[PDB]
Design a protein around this ligand. Sequence first.
Ligand SMILES: [Cu+]
Ligand SMILES: [Cu+]
Ligand SMILES: [Zn+2]
Ligand SMILES: [Zn+2]
Lengths: 151, 151
Amino acid sequence: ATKAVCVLKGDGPVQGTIHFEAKGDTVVVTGSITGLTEGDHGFHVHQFGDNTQGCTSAGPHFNPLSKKHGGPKDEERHVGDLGNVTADKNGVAIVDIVDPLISLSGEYSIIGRTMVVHEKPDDLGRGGNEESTKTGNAGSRLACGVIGIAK
Amino acid sequence: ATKAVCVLKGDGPVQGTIHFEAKGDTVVVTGSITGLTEGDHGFHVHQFGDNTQGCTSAGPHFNPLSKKHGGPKDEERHVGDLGNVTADKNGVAIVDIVDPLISLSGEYSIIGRTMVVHEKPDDLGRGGNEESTKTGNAGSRLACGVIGIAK
Ligand SMILES: [Cu+]
Ligand SMILES: [Cu+]
Ligand SMILES: [Zn+2]
Ligand SMILES: [Zn+2]
């Protein structure tokens, strides 16, 4: 794909639509997520596009390079590690990301994988417990969607 | 991918879980769809994995070869044309398909595309009208899901 889209859904108030575009050699990630608590929320590509057990069956973060969890600017990060989206007082987080590791084709393709927004801020792998190095302590998955080819 | 999965959801009673496995040069499609009226129901891969407008934003049957609509055993068929699933009196259709045209990788890859189950039987391009030649007269989209990568 050159364009992809993801509709985030869960059991609670959180919803969103995420768009992806292969621009130049990078992927531009845009959209919005609504119904969030104010502040940062972990935002990641999870390995499986599998919603059979809700957002749980999406598996861990997309990680073809077998690294520990990090922030999007880190060398040591998962390919899926897109950092945090930040909700305002109205519950709206505007997604605006350009990422060097994700792709919409080949080895790094996130098509058919899952976008997940989480309950808590991602500590970007700097929390100092084992959990930080896996998920950034971002906690439960509020909404997710399988990433699909868009027109 | 080598395995894929789709969760079909819509605005009514119909839902399902469809699994896909690359086997030799085919894709094995298994699963079930529940909440259907008894009888045949059109079942196709559609072009976009785009659920922003429910099943409508999936677009047409996946058709990279620009062919007319057919049944899965026809030479003249869309890549996405998987025929019908058949619901019993209890409303359960068991999906058991082997298809050589859809793929889980490359040009005919259905990863990131949308599986759709329909209101009416698919006449397999044999209804004698113009619509038959596009959609098999399978009617409304009861449920759909983006096909994602599975473990
Ligand atoms: Cu995540
Ligand atoms: Cu269809
Ligand atoms: Zn991670
Ligand atoms: Zn067709």
